[PDB]
Amino acid sequence: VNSFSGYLKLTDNVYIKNADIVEEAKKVKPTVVVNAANVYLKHGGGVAGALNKATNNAMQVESDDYIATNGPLKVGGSCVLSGHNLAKHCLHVVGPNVNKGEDIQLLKSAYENFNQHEVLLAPLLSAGIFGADPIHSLRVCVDTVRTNVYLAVFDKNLYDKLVSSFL
């Protein structure tokens, strides 16, 4: 039993809700919140810009030190950093950005990072400003993640389409 509330159950392990991931994180304080990161951990917009803003830029400060030490992530890769005031940990996951020409096949590799964590609050990877089809992202999530994932979908219209079209 966990503290996530109001989710529709899609499969044994995947759940979905129309919610703002920032407000959802502030309420649940999950062990892991997933960020829709880029390889430079530059949290300018989309989910990343919103999560970072909610931390009063502390996420960005921590991220800049991480990059200065370790260099950029790989597309499809991840790193674990602090969750600041939102969660215990933030798993920064880089899905392919279609608006940069990146291989959509890397979306499965990106979701594989979720399997290192028993429970996560997450957005749909590569959706939104990353340019991929969210219906496809949900399919890859369900077919790749085996741990318990609670997906927050900000746009109510998109949420209804994802549910109604789910196989």
Residue with tokens 């077919």: 143
Minimum distance from residue 134 beta carbon to ligand A1BJ2 (Å): 10
Minimum distance from residue 93 beta carbon to ligand A1BJ2 (Å): 13
Q: What are phi and psi of 3, to 5 degrees?
A: -95, 0
- When the beta carbons of 69 and 157 are compared against ligand A1BJ2, the nearer one is 157
Which residues are CB-neighbours of 86 under 8 A, at least 6 positions away? 22, 25, 26, 29, 33, 51, 54, 55
Assess 20 for contact with ligand A1BJ2 (CB under 6 A). Answer: yes
Question: Which DSSP letter does residue 57 get?
Answer: T
Rounded CA-CA distance 27/144 in Å is 27
Q: Which of 46, 76, 95, 134 binds ligand A1BJ2 (CB under 6 A)?
A: 46
> Alpha helix (H) ranges present in 29-90?
46-54, 58-70
Q: Residue 53, Cβ neighbours under 10 Å: how many?
A: 14
Minimum distance from residue 43 beta carbon to ligand A1BJ2 (Å): 11
Assess 134 for contact with ligand A1BJ2 (CB under 6 A). Answer: no
- When the beta carbons of 17 and 108 are compared against ligand A1BJ2, the nearer one is 17
Assess 149 for contact with ligand A1BJ2 (CB under 6 A). Answer: no
Assess 50 for contact with ligand A1BJ2 (CB under 6 A). Answer: yes
Asked if residues 31 and 87 have their Cβ atoms less than 8 Å apart, the reply is yes
Contact residues for ligand A1BJ2, defined by CB under 6 A: 20-22, 46-47, 50, 123, 128, 152, 154
